[PDB]
Structures are given as structure tokens and as C-alpha cells.
Amino acid sequence: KWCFRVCYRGICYRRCR
Numbered sequence: 001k002w003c004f005r006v007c008y009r010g011i012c013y014r015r016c017r
Contacts, residue, residue, distance in 0.1 A: 005014040 003016040005016065007013075
């Protein structure tokens with residue numbers, strides 16, 4: 001269970017599965 005959320009001007013998405 002690896003949860004890593006990040007938002008950048010070039011890439012904005014969240015990962016939590």
C-alpha cells in the first residue's frame with residue numbers, strides 16, 4: 001500500500017491504490 005500524491009505545473013495527479 002504505497003500512497004504518494006503530488007501536484008506539479010507539468011504533472012498533477014494522485015496515487016493511492
